[PDB]
């Protein structure tokens, strides 16, 4: 149906916007602390601590399968990246501090992204 096609065109346009949002968020992590999943080879106990791991590559795989239906879903995953890090790592570490910085800087990007997704519908 044409109704189905139009919904698919909306999903595709959301995906295009979320890709640009994701590039912008990832530029706020120049050290690439959040680029890849935490390795279970190098933190074997990780899954005893963190129930829902997340990272930018896993977000990008989901994005390219057009697996985000709205901004809320994408934000949930971004927040997991930050929130997992701040729980596993202590306040005085380079990791926790990189999470704080990504959060603060990412908040700006997401503030306007929420306006653009509303605005363009
Ligand atoms: Na902690």
Curated annotation (Swiss-Prot):
UniProt source species: Homo sapiens
Domain Bromo residues, every copy: 9-113
Role this protein plays: Scaffold subunit of various histone acetyltransferase (HAT) complexes, such as the MOZ/MORF and HBO1 complexes, that acts as a regulator of hematopoiesis. Plays a key role in HBO1 complex by directing KAT7/HBO1 specificity towards histone H3 'Lys-14' acetylation (H3K14ac), thereby promoting erythroid differentiation.
Self-association and partners: Component of some HBO1 complex composed of KAT7/HBO1, MEAF6, ING4 and BRD1/BRPF2. Component of the MOZ/MORF complex composed at least of ING5, KAT6A, KAT6B, MEAF6 and one of BRPF1, BRD1/BRPF2 and BRPF3. Interacts (via PHD-type zinc finger domain) with unmodified histone H3. Interacts (via PWWP domain) with dimethylated and trimethylated 'Lys-79' on histone H3.
Cross-link named Glycyl lysine isopeptide (Lys-Gly) (interchain with G-Cter in SUMO2), sites: 41
Location within or outside the cell: Nucleus; Chromosome
Tissue expr: Highly expressed in testis.
Protein name: Bromodomain-containing protein 1
